[PDB]
Amino acid sequence: SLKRVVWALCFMGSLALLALVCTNRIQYYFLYPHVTKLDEVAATRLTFPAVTFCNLNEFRFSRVTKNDLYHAGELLALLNNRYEIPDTQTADEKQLEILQDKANFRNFKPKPFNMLEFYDRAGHDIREMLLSCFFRGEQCSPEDFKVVFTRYGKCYTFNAGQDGKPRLITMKGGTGNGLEIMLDIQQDEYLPVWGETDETSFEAGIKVQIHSQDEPPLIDQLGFGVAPGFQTFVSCQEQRLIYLPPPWGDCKATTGEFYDTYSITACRIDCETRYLVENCNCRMVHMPGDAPYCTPEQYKECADPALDFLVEYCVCEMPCNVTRYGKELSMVKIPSKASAKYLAKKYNKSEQYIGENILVLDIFFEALNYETIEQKKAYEVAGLLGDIGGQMGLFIGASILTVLELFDYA
Amino acid sequence: KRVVWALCFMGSLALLALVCTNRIQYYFLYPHVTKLDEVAATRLTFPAVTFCNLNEFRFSRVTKNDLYHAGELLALLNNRYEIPDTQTADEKQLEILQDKANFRNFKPKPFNMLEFYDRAGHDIREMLLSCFFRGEQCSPEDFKVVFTRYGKCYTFNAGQDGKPRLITMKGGTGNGLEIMLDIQQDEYLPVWGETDETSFEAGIKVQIHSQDEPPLIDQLGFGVAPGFQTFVSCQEQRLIYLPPPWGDCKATTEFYDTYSITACRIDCETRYLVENCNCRMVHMPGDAPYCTPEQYKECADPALDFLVEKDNEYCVCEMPCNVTRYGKELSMVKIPSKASAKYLAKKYNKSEQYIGENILVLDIFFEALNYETIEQKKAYEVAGLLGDIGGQMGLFIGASILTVLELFD
Amino acid sequence: ALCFMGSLALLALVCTNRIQYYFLYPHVTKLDEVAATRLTFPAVTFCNLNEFRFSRVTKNDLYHAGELLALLNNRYEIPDTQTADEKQLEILQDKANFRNFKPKPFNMLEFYDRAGHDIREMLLSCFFRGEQCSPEDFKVVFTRYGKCYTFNAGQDGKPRLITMKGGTGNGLEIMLDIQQDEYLPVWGETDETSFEAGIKVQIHSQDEPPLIDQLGFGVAPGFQTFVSCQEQRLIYLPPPWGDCKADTYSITACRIDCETRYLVENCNCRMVHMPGDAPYCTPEQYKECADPALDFLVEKDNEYCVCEMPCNVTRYGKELSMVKIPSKASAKYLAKKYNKSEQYIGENILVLDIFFEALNYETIEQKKAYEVAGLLGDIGGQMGLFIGASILTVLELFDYAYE
Ligand SMILES: COc1ccc(Oc2ccc(-c3nc4ccc(C(=N)N)cc4[nH]3)cc2)cc1OC
Ligand SMILES: COc1ccc(Oc2ccc(-c3nc4ccc(C(=N)N)cc4[nH]3)cc2)cc1OC
Ligand SMILES: COc1ccc(Oc2ccc(-c3nc4ccc(C(=N)N)cc4[nH]3)cc2)cc1OC
Ligand SMILES: *[C@@H]1O[C@H](CO)[C@@H](O)[C@H](O)[C@H]1NC(C)=O
Ligand SMILES: *[C@@H]1O[C@H](CO)[C@@H](O)[C@H](O)[C@H]1NC(C)=O
Ligand SMILES: *[C@@H]1O[C@H](CO)[C@@H](O)[C@H](O)[C@H]1NC(C)=O
Ligand code: NA
């Protein structure tokens, strides 16, 4: 019969086709696809971020005591392993006099010694580095900086959000309307450079990280530099990422050892911290917990090889609520010739000092808005069924109530 | 056994109600997603470039009459009308002032801050040591004056009065705009004490913006320092965002013909200041009278310092739907080289010390000949709604829209 | 059944919308970032802004190229302008005396190589992930700035280097001496003459040549410059959805090819930075033919040679930061260490520090917005909604359209 052939001829193609296309939409769904929704929304306020900054130098040269030098000199490249000064013809005369004086161990009774105490006491004091401080055109004081220990030593966090302190906000973008600090980096307190190590800088300045209050600073890896002699502008953009969990993504939605709120920085410090305690029964200045802080012998012999080997293991995925701060750096010179003499008079320093040691850091929001980056689900379940039902109710006539009629037969 | 059957219709009917209502809610969220694209081009329209010298008024162009009317405002006179004892700056300046600042037998003359701003301001004619666009030279006539919160400022390629807008045909260092600026530090007003308005900075402020929007360079600027050639690698972005209900965008288009966040902020900030003090600042549009130095101290500084905190929503300025943004990557090298310092001093009758204190080279260009497009697309249209519910009907039931119409009888 | 005519019209309406939408070939974008344990480090190409060393310029160099280089006026003599330091003006006034001189052959590629800055003397210090490296890790490549060097070229069978940690130390950390004293003196102005001093750096995939005259950034002396990178994997869509195109293709290699086919066709000449086997331009040929020939291409024949984007692309985003060099504590030491003045150090030394912010890579991918499977579901659902229709019912109406 020609018709009931041409009929079932092209109907069998149509059932193979529905079988084909319906398999495509079930395979796609099981890839669990997502797409991205970029949006920007206007705002009237914006919570100002946390700002963590460090002097590139860890210990003030003048704050080193005789006791400090006995224990830490070989650690700091100020004594060779026989405990005396190299007398290298590279030196400041006055500093090498100060050192050999403090480094003469005749009839010396070693005293107790601790690395947090050294870091805390020898570290640069915000009270003397913070020549000037203004937030939204109102004044601020070293009280507004919370101390934090990083691999760069005693560092400070503005608007840290801790100890019941509210988070600062801003109501206008641009230079005057955020944080504007004038720092004095104190170059002549830098520990001298007579030979080289992994831990030696020719660098001079500060290191800065702008980060949310829910995450600690990781300023040795996430920092940026600000150099002396310039007022450096930091124009920021608030980005609110909302990312998708598994199966759609690799997000971490949950709660999270030594911290309470999960964040990639907080996670990487745990892997670093437990590894060092497990392999050396020891922690470093930047690590949380209760372990004893490392001794100079323990660092030379144990912790440095333990970290050196650790890199050559621990994966830390992104959280689902993440607020990031994008920034555009720009800079102009300080001081102007007109203000150079005044700044020296104002702070009892020479004009040469001001241009070698003064930086102004100026952090603000470009404008009152925040960008939103959200992974959205591409193929929900409701949309699959509409797609199959439409494909069924097209290639054939079936409903799901029909396919159940085929069981009422058998 | 047909109670298993009408149980199995009542269930499958409930499932259609649930899944179909989900797509009705989703549709009512008015969802959108984003389409990133990059498209090649053979030419590319060059932006406007607005720049300001960080100093507002040239020290040498300040007259006796200026000092009488604006001297206390500018931290050049204490409220007794004299140099403030401290006098912490070099004699030749302070000598220049002690003569200009002697009001014995002085007859005050009229004064206007815009006239002062225009007249004392840095002149593009002395600032612009050199200028090249697409390797061809340019002159101060290609820069148009605009008054900003920084004063008398200059915009390259302003696009106004029927002048064609420049284009570019190649990316990289030379193939856009390269200026050598003299910021003229020896003209900066002295600093003897501090004010809200006093800076230790020296250099220029630059904003790269489309010609459809005015410069708001005291917020949207960036700094360029003297002593460097500063490279500005730009990427053109044409973002097209969606109106309500999908977004919060503005397609509608007072003080300006074309909507822009900047035009809205300057407009709102202007209406506020005129309402509360009958007074506008130099950077503001319109026809209101310009603030006098007394009106600033007595009215506008407090009026603005109060709008900084207790206000905000007098204007939320929403984004327009068709927006061109310029991304910029800043880089720099030192100018001048040891070989070219001596040549540069000779060229401009200036000291070698001066050049390293006052010369900057600004280099604005496109990374490459293309533009990115960031585009909001609707995720769930009405046509796709019907396809989704119709299929669920034609799946859980055999139902059509006509079938549900028979059930009303 | 009266208003059936309406519901059929609505099916025509909605079905035309989703059928036209399909043919726009819509795509939307999928942003994701995925964590990694290792990460392949890029190539880094850098140039001294200065092309030829003053000390390596010979009398023969000066005869053929002195006018090309604004070192001689078109009478072949020194401008004798005292606008440069005496020792160098004496060095050149000497080299420029053409009494009894037999000119010898000369080609521009040799000059670029020999007078160009030598990688062995610029590279004061080199560390990759804290381990030492040597000028042997730098492959020479010729760009418009002359003899330039590419670290981790990935060429000559060397495996591609990786890094396992982010931050300051764990990338490439070179300390350069830009050698301000070998910069050619500047006596007058040219298209090709600079007041600048420092280097130009480009971070690129090993699969593409550097286009450092267009895509570089500047590094200045007197600073350690921090370069924080983020690896981006772009996967973009071919036609009809997009305009991407699927030794190795790259946008850079496409432009350098258009630039070379054009210059050889019109001047039978190639420039130092160009690939192939054509002869290199003589100073007169550049003067007489190529300089106007390239000038013309930018204005009229960019439009004829169009270069589309590739479909698998790895980009490197960079954030520049800097701190001062050298510190007062280390200023005296670096002078002693390299037998140079403290003022020389602050005028000639930069430390370039390239690294990844952290161990992850972003992926920006164009995805198809409306495929064919999803079209049918939408129209099929619309058919089974406004009417009862399947495709079979439409075949009954063509059966019945056999009466
Ligand atoms: C308990 O916590 C810790 C204990 C020991 C640690 O090990 C070291 C810390 C610092 C240095 C070091 N800092 C220098 C600065 C300048 C110079 C210079 N001469 N320019 C030389 C320096 N050496 C060396 C080893 C680390 C810890 O926390 C990370
Ligand atoms: C009609 O429009 C306006 C009227 C008044 C305005 O008020 C002021 C404008 C400028 C200053 C100011 N700029 C200084 C720079 C350097 C120094 C220094 N001593 N170095 C001191 C300065 N004082 C102060 C007040 C503003 C207006 O429009 C914005
Ligand atoms: C076959 O390959 C080529 C041949 C010729 C080319 O043309 C020129 C190459 C270099 C210069 C040039 N470099 C200078 C550096 C310093 C100074 C200074 N006075 N300080 C002046 C300089 N002039 C000019 C023209 C280009 C080629 O390939 C790109
Ligand atoms: C966190 O995630 C929740 C999930 O619903 C979301 O509503 C909220 O906006 C996110 N942000 C904060 C700061 O809680
Ligand atoms: C965007 O702007 C251009 C010119 O301003 C105009 O031609 C175009 O129609 C506008 N709309 C879109 C969606 O591009
Ligand atoms: C390139 O695209 C292909 C898709 O066919 C993919 O398999 C591959 O991982 C991509 N990346 C590279 C580096 O080739
Ligand atoms: Na659908």
Residue numbers in the entry:
A (entry chain B): 41 to 296, 299 to 354, 359 to 456
B (entry chain A): 43 to 295, 299 to 454
C (entry chain C): 48 to 293, 302 to 458
Q: What does the primary publication say about this deposited structure?
A:
Acid-sensing ion channels (ASICs) are proton-gated cation channels widely expressed in nervous systems. Mammalian ASIC1a is the most studied ASIC to date, serves as a primary sensor of acidosis in the brain and is involved in a variety of biological processes, including synaptic function and plasticity, pain sensation, seizure, and neuronal injury. ASIC1a can be activated at near neutral pH and can proceed to desensitize from either closed/pre-open or open channels in a pH-dependent manner (closed-state and open-state desensitization, respectively). An emerging picture from these studies indicates a dynamic acidic pocket that adopts an expanded conformation in the closed state due to electrostatic repulsion and contracts in the open and desensitized states with the protonation of the acidic pairs/residues.
